[PDB]
Amino acid sequence: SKGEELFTGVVPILVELDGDVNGHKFSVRGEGEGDATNGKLTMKFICTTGKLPVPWPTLVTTLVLCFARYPDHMKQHDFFKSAMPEGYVQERTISFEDDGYYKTRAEVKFEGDTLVNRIELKGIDFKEDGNILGHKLEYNFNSHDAYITADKQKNGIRSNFKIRLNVEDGSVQLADHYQQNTPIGDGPVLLPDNHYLSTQNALSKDPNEKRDHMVLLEFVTASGI
């Protein structure tokens, strides 16, 4: 795949998110690099408008599946890299149990040598002292698997998956994700057989950083074929 050739080394990443949750407007910018050969990415994100009005763990999945590692032994098509450099649109509904929901639309594509994820996020119907707007979630993110299927009619893929967010009182709150991806432009893409992506995330803080921020290490690996 020609798109696959763009990922054999280390690739710089830029993430830009404009958000509006219950009328609270905010922006996030992130920079880092991705190593798709190892399924690895490292990022630092900053809330550039001041205080982030939602917990950072609720934004992890919104803030580049082209950096997944697709192992040889499954020998299956990589939709996300095959769409590059022109890239793809990634859209989601994210529902939080007994609370509001996010709607997201992002374009993932090369701008020069940088893989860019540019996102528009809207949050609706949140409770002002629920776990999200009330900041009652732990600063961590559990490992999870997500099932990927081909969407033949839209020449893309879909994925419905759940995330278990840890609440400060010891319980969990489900954030259910409903995702669809479609290619940008008219280049040919590879539609995969059904498979899984497995993800792990390590969240930390920069001790010299005064702004509201998140340092992230993430691994994404394909399986099941």
Side-chain angles (χ1 to χ4, degrees), residues 108-138:
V108 185
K109 67 235 174 138
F110 275 90
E111 295 184 342
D113 69 331
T114 301
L115 189 282
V116 177
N117 179 22
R118 181 165 297 109
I119 312 139
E120 280 286 347
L121 178 152
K122 182 94 170 313
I124 303 109
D125 291 336
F126 282 86
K127 301 174 173 170
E128 276 294 345
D129 213 56
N131 297 334
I132 287 93
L133 293 177
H135 294 267
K136 313 185 195 173
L137 302 183
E138 296 183 352

Side-chain angles (χ1 to χ4, degrees), residues 169-180:
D169 65 1
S171 59
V172 300
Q173 183 175 16
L174 275 287
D176 292 338
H177 294 58
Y178 306 93
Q179 178 186 330
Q180 58 184 15

Side-chain angles (χ1 to χ4, degrees), residues 82-127:
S82 75
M84 297 293 165
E86 297 83 0
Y88 53 84
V89 174
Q90 173 162 304
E91 289 166 303
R92 298 199 179 99
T93 295
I94 303 172
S95 69
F96 299 84
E97 188 103 31
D98 198 20
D99 208 336
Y101 61 98
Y102 294 162
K103 301 289 304 292
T104 68
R105 184 192 186 277
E107 298 190 10
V108 185
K109 67 235 174 138
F110 275 90
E111 295 184 342
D113 69 331
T114 301
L115 189 282
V116 177
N117 179 22
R118 181 165 297 109
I119 312 139
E120 280 286 347
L121 178 152
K122 182 94 170 313
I124 303 109
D125 291 336
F126 282 86
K127 301 174 173 170

Side-chain angles (χ1 to χ4, degrees), residues 38-50 52-74 76-88:
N38 285 312
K40 174 184 177 186
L41 57 95
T42 54
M43 299 288 298
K44 183 179 174 196
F45 300 94
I46 290 148
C47 182
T48 61
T49 53
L52 194 70
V54 301
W56 284 102
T58 71
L59 300 181
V60 169
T61 57
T62 298
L63 295 164
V64 292
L65 300 176
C66 48
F67 288 105
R69 176 172 78 97
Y70 273 77
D72 283 307
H73 68 253
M74 94 180 47
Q76 188 42 35
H77 297 338
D78 184 341
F79 163 83
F80 307 99
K81 289 183 190 61
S82 75
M84 297 293 165
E86 297 83 0
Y88 53 84

Side-chain angles (χ1 to χ4, degrees), residues 146-151 154-161:
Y147 192 56
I148 312 293
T149 67
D151 183 353
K154 289 173 141 262
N155 203 33
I157 57 104
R158 294 196 187 241
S159 180
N160 298 327
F161 62 96

Side-chain angles (χ1 to χ4, degrees), residues 26-39:
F26 63 100
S27 293
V28 176
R29 178 191 183 91
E31 290 176 2
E33 56 182 31
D35 172 13
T37 301
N38 285 312

